[PDB]
Curated annotation (Swiss-Prot), chain B:
Top-level taxonomy: Eukaryota, Discoba, Euglenozoa, Kinetoplastea, Metakinetoplastina
PROSITE patterns, A to Z: PUR_PYR_PR_TRANSFER
Database matches in PANTHER family: HYPOXANTHINE PHOSPHORIBOSYLTRANSFERASE (PTHR43340:SF1), HYPOXANTHINE-GUANINE PHOSPHORIBOSYLTRANSFERASE (PTHR43340)
Cofactor(s) in the UniProt record: Mg(2+)
One GO term of the biological process aspect: hypoxanthine metabolic process
Protein name, UniProt field: Hypoxanthine-guanine phosphoribosyltransferase
Source organism (scientific name): Trypanosoma brucei brucei
Length: 177, 177
C-alpha cells in the first residue's frame, strides 16, 4: 500500500473527483428549475466542520463548473438567514445519522425553501435511525477510514485519498495517550 | 478575452496558485525540518481564519502533506508547546491577523507564523509581514479561491478582478430591497 500508516486505499482523490462530477451533474439537473443565481439566489451550502472542509472546498468548485452558484456557511459537528433559500447540507461521513438528523431538523426551523444532504462517505450499515442522504459520493462498509478531511484524533485529514487506517496506528496511540 | 463575464481580469489561475503553493510548501518543509513534525505526536497546527480561507486551507494542507509536513486543523471565525501556522486567504489592513496572532500567543505555542494566499502590501493600516505569501496583488478588489463578494463567487477557481457592473448592479438591487 502506498501509505505506511494505511492498510489499503479505498478511494483515490481522482476517483472521488470523478464521483463528485457525477453528483454535480445530478445537482445541476435537480436545481435547474429553481433559477439559482449568484447574489440573488445562490444554493446555500451548509458545511459541517471540521471534517467536511476538504470535500466542501472541492465540491463548491465542481458545482461552479456545472453552473450551480453557491454561498457557504459553516457549522461545527461538536455542536451536534436561510428562510426561503435552497439549502444543501454537506457532511464528510454519514454513519449512525444522529448528527445529520439533528442538523437538518435544526435548519428546518428557519423555513428554507428546501433542504437536501450531500455526503462524501455513507456507511449505510451504521444507522441508529433511518436516514437517506439525497446525494452520496461513495459507500463504505464497517471499516474505520481517514483522509479527504476525515481524521483520527485530529491527524490524517490531509491525506489525499480515503484509506483504512491500520490498527497498529490507533491501538498504539490509545496506549500512549 | 476574460473567460468570466463577471470579471475584467484573471490575476492568478488555480494552476498558478498551486505552483506557487508548492514553492511555499518546500520552504515550510525546510523551515520546520528541525521541529520533528509527526502525525498524532507533533503535527503542525493549522489555524484557518474562516470563511474565506477554507479553499486555500483544503488545498494547502494537502500540498503540505505531499512535502512531508503533517498537520491538524482548527477554524476561527490547546496549542501550548505546539507549532502554529495561521492561514488567511487575504492579508490587507492586517488588523485581523494582528489580533489573531496576538490572541494565540497568549497560549504559549512553541512558535507561531503566518501563511497568506493573497497579500495586498499596499493595504496596511498597521505594520505586518506574513512569513509566507503565495501571491501579491495590487490595490484592487478580487474574488475567487475562497474570496467573496457579498458571499458569492468564492467557488470561482481563479483569483479575478470583479467587474464594477456586478457590484453597481447588486448595490442598486440592495438599495431597492
Ligand atoms: C463523530 C463524527 N462522525 C464520524 C464517526 N464515524 C463513523 N465512521 C467513521 C469513519 O470511518 N472514520 C471517521 N474519521 N469517523 C467515523 C459521526 C457521524 P454520525 O455517526 O453522527 O452519523
Ligand atoms: N469579508 C471579509 C474579511 C475582510 N478581510 C478581507 C477583505 N478584503 C480586502 N481586500 C479584499 C479583496 O480584494 N477581495 C475580497 N473578497 N475581500 C477583501 C480583511 C483582511 P485584513 O484587512 O484584516 O488584513
Ligand atoms: Mg471525471
Ligand atoms: Mg449520483
Ligand atoms: Mg461530521
Ligand atoms: Mg467526528
Ligand atoms: Mg480569511
Ligand atoms: Mg468577505
Amino acid at each position: 500500500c502506498k501509505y505506511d500508516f494505511a492498510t489499503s486505499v479505498l478511494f483515490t482523490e481522482a476517483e472521488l473527483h470523478t464521483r463528485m462530477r457525477g453528483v454535480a451533474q445530478r445537482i445541476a439537473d435537480d436545481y435547474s428549475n429553481c433559477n439559482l443565481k449568484p447574489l440573488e439566489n445562490p444554493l446555500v451550502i451548509v458545511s459541517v466542520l471540521k471534517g467536511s472542509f476538504v470535500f466542501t472546498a472541492d465540491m463548491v468548485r465542481i458545482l461552479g463548473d456545472f453552473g450551480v452558484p453557491t454561498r457557504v456557511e459553516f457549522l461545527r459537528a461538536s455542536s451536534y438567514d436561510i428562510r426561503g433559500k435552497h439549502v444543501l447540507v454537506l457532511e464528510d461521513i454519514l454513519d449512525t445519522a444522529l448528527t445529520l438528523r439533528e442538523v437538518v431538523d435544526s435548519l428546518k426551523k428557519s423555513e428554507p425553501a428546501s433542504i437536501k444532504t450531500l455526503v462524501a462517505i455513507d456507511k449505510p450499515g451504521g444507522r441508529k435511525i433511518p436516514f437517506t442522504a439525497e446525494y452520496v459520493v461513495a459507500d463504505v462498509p464497517n471499516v474505520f477510514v481517514v483522509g479527504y478531511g476525515l481524521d483520527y484524533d485530529q491527524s490524517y485529514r490531509e491525506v489525499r485519498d480515503v484509506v483504512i487506517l491500520k490498527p497498529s496506528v490507533y491501538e498504539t496511540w490509545g496506549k500512549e495517550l
